[PDB]
Amino acid sequence: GTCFDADMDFRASLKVRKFSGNLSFIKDTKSLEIYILTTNDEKARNVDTLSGGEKSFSQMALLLATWKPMRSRIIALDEFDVFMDQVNRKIGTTLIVKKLKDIARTQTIIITPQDIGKIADIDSSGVSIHRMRDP
Amino acid sequence: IGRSKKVEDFIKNGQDVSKIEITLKNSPNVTDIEYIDARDETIKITRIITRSKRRSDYLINDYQVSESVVKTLVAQLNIQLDNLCQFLSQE
Amino acid sequence: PVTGDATAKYLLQYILSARGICHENALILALMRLETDASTLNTEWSIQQWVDKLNDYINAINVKLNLLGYKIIRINHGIGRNAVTLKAKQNFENTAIRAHNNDYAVLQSIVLPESNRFFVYVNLASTEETKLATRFNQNEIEFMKWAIEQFMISGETIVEGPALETSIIVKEVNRILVAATGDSNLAKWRKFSTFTVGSTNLFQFQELTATDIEDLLLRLCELKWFYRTQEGKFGIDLRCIAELEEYLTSMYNLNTCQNCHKLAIQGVRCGNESCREENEETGENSLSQIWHVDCFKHYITHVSKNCDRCGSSLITEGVYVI
Amino acid sequence: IEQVDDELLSLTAQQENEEQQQQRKRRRHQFAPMTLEESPSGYIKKVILRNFMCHEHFELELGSRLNFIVGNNGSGKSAILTAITIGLGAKASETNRGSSLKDLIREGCYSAKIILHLDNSKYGAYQQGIFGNEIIVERIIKRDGPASFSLRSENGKEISNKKKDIQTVVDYFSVPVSNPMCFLSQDAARSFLTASTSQDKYSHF
Amino acid sequence: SQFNWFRIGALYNTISKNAPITDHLMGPLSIEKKP
Amino acid sequence: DSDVDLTEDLAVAKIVKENPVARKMVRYILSRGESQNSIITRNKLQSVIHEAAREENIAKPSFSKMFMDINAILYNVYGFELQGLPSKNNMNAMPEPLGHRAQKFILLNNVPHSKNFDDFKILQSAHTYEELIVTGEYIGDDIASGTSNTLESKLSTDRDLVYKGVLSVILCIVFFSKNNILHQELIKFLETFGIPSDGSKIAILNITIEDLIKSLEKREYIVRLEEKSDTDGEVISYRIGRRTQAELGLESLEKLVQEIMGLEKEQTKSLHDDIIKSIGDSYSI
Amino acid sequence: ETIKAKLKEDHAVLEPKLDDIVSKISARFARLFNNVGSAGAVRLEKPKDYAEWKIEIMVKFRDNAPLKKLDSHTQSGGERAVSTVLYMIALQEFTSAPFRVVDEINQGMDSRNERIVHKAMVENACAENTSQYFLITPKLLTGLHYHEKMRIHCVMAGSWIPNPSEDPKMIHFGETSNYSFD
């Protein structure tokens, strides 16, 4: 059940970047393999056979798809801006917003130093930004 | 040879006798041979199948013999038909 | 193509025959022995112009390679000054003539007591559609990638003790330190770096058995890709970093030395604990502030002796990298 | 080997205790028909931190679904997560924010207060008749004496002062405070997001 | 393992046979994924 | 003639710029013929040329023009050149090399050899060999020293030199045995050097003698002529392949054999005739 | 004591002969399976009881298939046919039979195992003084390899081709050396 929920949420998460992928859990190798198919190729290459931005997006999607199976009323997270660089970081924040603002059962507290108000994706309702006046 | 026996298949439809001739090298190490010397290098074995006659009659250098002589010659050439190693068929 | 072209071709073939990387003194001696049969004897010459007459030919070969798709990089080795120049009694050119390092001198007496930069034949192509393999299959490629990953991971050390393994590098570091200032009290800090260290971890490969791993590692060592220290720990040599300049920077987050852009594999790296920011995962100077041996000697003997990374005392510096 | 038999008997007794504990639990949801889009109860409406770590008594009204605190790093950015984990009830070693609960107290003050306001007005409430529309969770950390609690309601009537009521309320609301992934700190997030080997991904998942 | 198996090998492939020798570095090891 | 060299280099640069597929073909040839040190087949050349042309969407040039451009680039950059090879049936049944109508090709250097550079290389190899296997040892995991050959030496892979030495010994055996040597007697003669014939792998190379001979035959070093009979049985005769004929000329063989027996340069005469007599019917020339 | 002495003498006489025979047949098996790129040897396992001695065949033609005794159900038909044909070939030089006859053999086995067994047959025919095999090819295979030593014979007849009896040169079927002098 847990792996099914994680697989489905990862598949639904990759659609944001117009990708199509899946998770595979292997007990023979005791490993989790991520397969992603992007726009250019026609064969689902191994996730390691990709670039930095795609791998970071896959890792963020895996984080969300690991939060998903365990239904948590409250979820909290610290900064992630140092693990993603420029455009990929904006796409990752967009993925977090899009996947987490819909669900009402789970309240998410994301603590980031980067100003979300600079991101154009703030007009979406259900997202609360509490910018500390005192630096 | 480990297969069904159909003598009529060999015989041409209409013809009385069907004939096969096979020639082999001869060496002075095999006995019970007709008309052929030990120093000779030719062994001619002929088999004929006919509808009217039902017997085992072979030919050695064109000389009629019973199947026993040709069988013991085959034995003395270290070649075997019943054994599956020398001859391989579908069965 | 009478004299100059033949000499250039011979120099390039000598560079290639040495598995790409070759010592600069060997190239100088080869150029001497090629020029002594080119124009008269050239007895009355100076090394100050010999080095230029080598460098211009090297650049002439390099531009042809670049328009063809290759390049010769004069990448300096991590170990420099006399430590790497000594070799085995300088250049090789006793009951019989089998061991004579100081004999067969070129002309009357020619010797190069200083040599640090090595010339390496590298390919600038990244995708490399034309070439798919050299002599190995995919299992060996996977083993090589795993070994590179293990070497990259082993760079960070937790604490380390005062083992003080003294084979090559730390002797030169101590010589540089005592040349800068005479302390001899706490120069040998208890912090060690294992950027190129692995003995048993490489043997834990799954697809290949122990015998295959040993054979492949020995073949790579003979090919001068993975080198072993005096203790017996495998590590990447200068050839690997000279070739894979982009593989160790794009896939793995690495920083350069005081130069504009260069791969640091050994030298001095303390960083204390407050690294530049926090980086992706690893810290302790994982974003910047790394030095070579020659770079450290140049920096410590010039202005601003103290580290520029927000201030760092010399007492805590002197971390040995192996 | 009698030690093997002793271990077998101990494991059997542990299974017996676990099955008794399972048998003790009953149903806690009554299925109030009511009316989906609206969030269920249990989310944190507000947190107030009086003399906690760096900043002074501070109010913060968290949103219902997604919150983006833009407290700059080095200004007690992680204070909110630490306060929430401590107030909801969690092991100090799991949090890994501060050397001890004593250090969480602001310097120069002997006590610190963490007050949380879980929402009960919406459906799924835990004893909405008793606690009302809000459940207040206040924890006091003092340099001298044990850390104190009260699970007071809106009117200030201290319903309880124990810790088992904390666990009952939290489990009813299904807040995995014991799981260190639901409340990701900086180091845990860095360790998870930088996982490279497929074995590391499998382990973390 | 008593005789010079390198000196004869050094005479060959260098003085004679005029055979090109190249390191042929492991270029396909770092193949770009061209995303 | 510096201006001549400069304008030749400019012409080569213009040629390589005009034909991008030529650069890729030169790179592929330098990869295949040098990494595996094998013989390039004619059939694969057309396939790779067509594939590169389709990838580059450039009209396919003439094969002769492509070969000439490749040879010019190799001679101007690496100094190498491609020489054609005859057919093996000609020998079983001054010739200018085919060049454009040959079924096989191999990279070959075309610069005259010096007198001291090779001496320097062989002396460096001998100096390194004195300590490579000192006291019957070996480098690598066997000992605690990895950088035994200093920072860099001429030993290459520490096994290619042994392979070339064994190849030279085999060629000398085949060339001087009236161009007809049997397998068993060749093994017996090689046993004098110290190579075991009981199936144990040879040192350094770690390859059995039979596999080494098979690899040599595969790489066109030797030809396994099979004049098998009956009274005695199967007969394995070793010949000289066309690759060896192209690599080793008369003057090249004389230069190689001059230092083999250490004969003085004054007695160089009356030796070339003996070499020609020993070679016999081996070269198509 | 006398019984055990006699048993030891009989075992001492018997052991070297079958040992060398097994070594030779295993070497032949390996040299015939090298073209397949597989390692196999005909081993004679000899337990304490003499009647319990058995024959083991090592299989490597398929990586998935583990090393086990030859059987039809677990292994593929083509690989098994190639293995048994090679085992037959190995026991030919030792035997004094002038030739061996194989029927329904060249019929396709996956067009790959059949190709490698044809390559093995070519290699065996390269050696001289070898047995003549009367090969049968019920199904035609595209791109068959034809060695110079062996010659192909065709018995098919064409409508435009005259009757064999009336045509003096048509009596021979699948023969080319007959037309040429000598």
XYZ file of C-alpha atoms in Angstrom, chain A residues 26-93:
68
model
C 13.709 -4.026 -5.604
C 14.487 -6.411 -2.756
C 17.079 -8.337 -4.774
C 19.154 -5.147 -4.985
C 17.470 -3.560 -1.922
C 17.205 -0.341 -3.909
C 14.714 2.207 -5.213
C 15.085 2.954 -8.929
C 13.493 6.034 -10.498
C 12.720 5.901 -14.219
C 11.895 9.168 -15.997
C 10.887 9.807 -19.616
C 11.237 13.409 -20.780
C 10.186 15.093 -24.021
C 13.265 14.360 -26.144
C 13.898 10.623 -25.789
C 11.532 7.695 -26.311
C 12.994 5.324 -23.688
C 12.679 5.737 -19.922
C 16.317 6.242 -18.973
C 17.570 5.728 -15.443
C 17.148 8.868 -13.343
C 20.910 9.022 -12.799
C 21.290 9.406 -16.591
C 19.911 12.950 -16.412
C 20.986 16.469 -15.487
C 21.196 18.294 -12.177
C 17.865 20.088 -12.439
C 15.946 16.962 -13.427
C 17.542 14.950 -10.618
C 16.773 17.659 -8.048
C 13.161 17.827 -9.238
C 12.929 14.034 -8.998
C 14.307 14.135 -5.446
C 11.781 16.796 -4.426
C 8.973 14.766 -5.998
C 10.220 11.718 -4.088
C 10.127 13.747 -0.869
C 6.501 14.695 -1.516
C 5.638 11.118 -2.554
C 7.154 9.879 0.715
C 5.114 12.377 2.722
C 1.975 11.250 0.874
C 1.514 7.602 2.026
C 1.756 8.575 5.706
C -1.316 10.783 6.098
C -0.017 13.557 8.359
C -2.255 16.323 9.673
C 0.743 18.660 10.053
C 4.004 18.684 8.078
C 6.883 21.117 8.615
C 10.055 21.698 6.615
C 13.116 23.958 6.661
C 14.897 25.636 3.753
C 15.692 23.847 0.495
C 17.003 26.795 -1.556
C 20.652 25.725 -1.208
C 20.019 22.315 -2.799
C 18.596 23.753 -6.043
C 20.077 26.493 -8.218
C 18.180 29.290 -10.003
C 15.479 28.049 -12.417
C 15.279 24.556 -10.945
C 14.720 26.079 -7.488
C 11.788 28.111 -8.815
C 10.339 24.986 -10.441
C 10.752 23.057 -7.187
C 8.990 25.740 -5.167
